[PDB]
Amino acid sequence: MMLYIVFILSVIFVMGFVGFSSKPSPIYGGLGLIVSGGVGCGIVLNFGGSFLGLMVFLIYLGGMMVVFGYTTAMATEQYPEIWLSNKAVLGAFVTGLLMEFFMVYYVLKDKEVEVVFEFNGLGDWVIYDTGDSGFFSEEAMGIAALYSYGTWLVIVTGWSLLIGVVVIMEITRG
C-alpha cells in the first residue's frame, strides 16, 4: 500500500484541482490550490526532488496568501459559495469526483487503464532507477548549474522580473 504512495498523492492532487476548478468562492478555491500544492510537493519529493517540491509549495503558499487578501477586497460577496451552495458548482464538483473515482477504480482493478491514452497501473515505482551511490543530490547539481550554464536564462528571467515591477506600476496607475 505504501508502494502506491505517489498514486495516492496524485489522487488527492486531482481532488484539489476539482476543488478550485469548480470555482466556489476564491477563499475555498485558494484552499483547494494549497492542498494540491502540498501533495504536489509530496509527489515531486518522492521522485528525488526535495528542493523542487519544497520550492513549489513555498511559492504557492505566498501566492495564495496574496490571493486571499485580494479576495477579501475585490472578489467577495455577501454569501460566499461553498461547493454545496450552488447547483453549477456542486455539479462540476461531483462530475469531477466521479470521473476521478472511475479512473482510479478501474486502473487499480486491471493494474492498467485506457482513458483515451494507455496508462500502466503497476505502481509508479517500477520505472525508477536501480543503481545510484553518488555523494551529491543530482537535482541540487542541476539547479546550481543555473549560475554557470544558464547565464542566458539568468539574464532573461532577471530582466523579466524587473520589467514586471515596472509594468504593474504602469497598469495600476489610472
Binding site: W152, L153, V156, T157, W159, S160, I163, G164, V166, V167, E170, I171, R173, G174
Partner: protein, 347 residues
C-alpha cells in the same frame, strides 16, 4: 508613461519576439512569448479607460491560456523524445496543442473573437503593433514545426479564417475592427500555404505587415478611427485620400498592385501540389475583403462626403504627426509587383 519607460517597454516587446526567433530551445521560446506578453499589456492600458481595461483583460486571458497549451505541448514533446530542440514535434497530440496554441496567439478563427474587440479597445498606435509585430513570433514558430503539423487542422483553420475574416468585415463601421477582421482573413492565406511552401508564408507576412503599417499610419496621421471621421479627409489632406485608395486597392489584391503578389504566388504553390479547389475557394472568398475595402474607398476618395463648418479651422494648420516611414511604406505597398522575383531573397 515616462518617455524612457515607454522606450524600455517597447524594446522588451521586441526582445521577447527576438528571443522566440533566435531560440533553439522550447523553454526559451516559451519565455520569449511570456516576456512579449508582459510588455504589451502596459501599451494596451496606456490610455487608462474602461475600454482599454477590458481590451487588455481579454488579451491577457487569451494569450495566457495559449501559453499554457504551448507549455503543455513542450512537456509532452519532452516525454516522448527527451529533448527540447525547436523543430518538428514527436507526438501528434503535442502537435495539435502547439498548433491550437499558436492559432490562439495569432487570433485565427475559430479562436478569433478577441482580435476585433482588443484592437477596437486600444489606441491606433497599439493596434498597429498588435496586428503586425505580434504576428512575427507565432509565425516564426510555425515556420519551424510545420513538418509535424496536421494538414487537415491547419487548412481548416486557414479556411475558417478567410471566411470569418471576410464576413466579419462586412458589418463594421469602425476602422480598427475593419483592420482586425482584415487581419484574420490575411492570416488564413499565410497558414494555408504553410504546409506547401513556407517561403510563401513569409512573403505574405512581409507584404501584409507593410500594407497594414501603411494603413494604420495614415489613420494615425488624421487621428481617424471611424468610417465617417475618415470621410472628412478629402477636405483636409487630399493627397492622403489617394494614398489610402491605392493601399486599399492593393490590400484587396488587385493587379498591378503589390498586394496581388502574395495571392498570386500562393495560388501557384498550391496548384503545383494539385490543390485546385482550395485556392479557387480562397480567391473567391477574398472578394469579401475587397468589397468592404471598396466601401472605404467610396466614402474616402471616390466621393465627397458632407463636412462641418469647424473643419475650416483645420485648413490653417499643417500635419504635425511623425508619419514615420510612410512615404516608403506606401510605395512598397503599391509598386512592388514588377519586382516579384525578388521573393527568392526569402529562401
Amino acid at each position: 508613461m515616462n518617455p524612457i519607460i515607454f522606450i524600455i517597454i517597447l524594446l522588451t516587446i521586441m526582445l521577447g519576439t527576438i528571443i522566440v526567433m533566435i531560440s533553439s530551445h522550447w523553454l526559451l521560446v516559451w519565455i520569449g512569448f511570456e516576456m512579449n506578453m508582459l510588455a504589451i499589456i502596459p501599451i494596451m492600458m496606456k490610455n487608462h479607460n474602461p475600454r482599454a481595461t477590458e481590451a487588455s483583460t481579454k488579451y491577457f486571458l487569451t494569450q495566457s491560456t495559449a501559453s499554457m497549451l504551448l507549455m503543455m505541448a513542450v512537456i509532452i514533446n519532452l516525454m516522448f523524445s527527451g529533448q527540447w530542440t525547436v523543430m518538428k514535434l514527436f507526438n501528434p497530440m503535442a502537435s495539435m496543442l502547439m498548433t491550437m496554441a499558436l492559432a490562439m496567439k495569432l487570433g485565427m478563427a475559430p479562436f478569433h473573437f478577441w482580435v476585433p474587440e482588443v484592437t477596437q479597445g486600444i489606441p491606433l498606435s497599439s493596434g498597429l503593433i498588435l496586428l503586425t509585430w505580434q504576428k512575427l513570433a507565432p509565425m516564426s514558430v510555425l515556420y519551424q514545426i510545420f513538418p509535424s503539423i496536421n494538414l487537415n487542422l491547419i487548412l481548416t483553420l486557414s479556411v475558417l479564417s478567410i471566411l470569418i475574416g471576410g464576413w466579419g468585415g462586412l458589418n463594421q463601421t469602425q476602422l480598427r475592427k475593419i483592420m482586425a477582421y482584415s487581419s484574420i482573413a490575411h492570416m488564413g492565406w499565410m497558414t494555408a500555404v504553410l504546409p506547401y511552401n513556407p517561403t510563401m508564408t513569409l512573403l505574405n507576412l512581409i507584404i501584409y505587415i507593410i500594407m497594414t503599417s501603411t494603413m494604420f499610419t495614415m489613420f494615425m496621421a488624421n487621428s481617424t478611427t471611424t468610417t465617417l471621421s475618415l470621410s472628412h479627409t478629402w477636405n483636409k489632406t487630399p493627397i492622403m485620400t489617394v494614398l489610402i485608395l491605392a493601399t486599399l486597392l492593393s490590400m484587396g489584391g488587385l493587379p498591378p498592385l503589390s498586394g496581388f503578389m502574395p495571392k498570386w504566388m500562393i495560388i501557384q504553390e498550391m496548384t503545383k501540389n494539385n490543390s485546385i479547389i482550395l485556392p479557387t475557394f480562397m480567391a473567391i472568398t477574398a472578394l469579401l475583403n475587397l468589397y468592404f475595402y471598396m466601401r472605404l474607398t467610396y466614402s474616402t476618395t471616390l466621393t465627397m462626403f458632407p463636412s462641418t463648418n469647424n473643419m475650416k479651422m483645420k485648413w490653417q494648420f499643417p500635419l504635425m504627426k511623425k508619419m514615420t516611414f510612410l512615404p516608403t511604406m506606401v510605395v512598397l505597398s503599391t509598386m512592388m509587383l514588377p519586382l516579384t522575383p525578388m521573393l527568392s531573397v526569402l529562401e
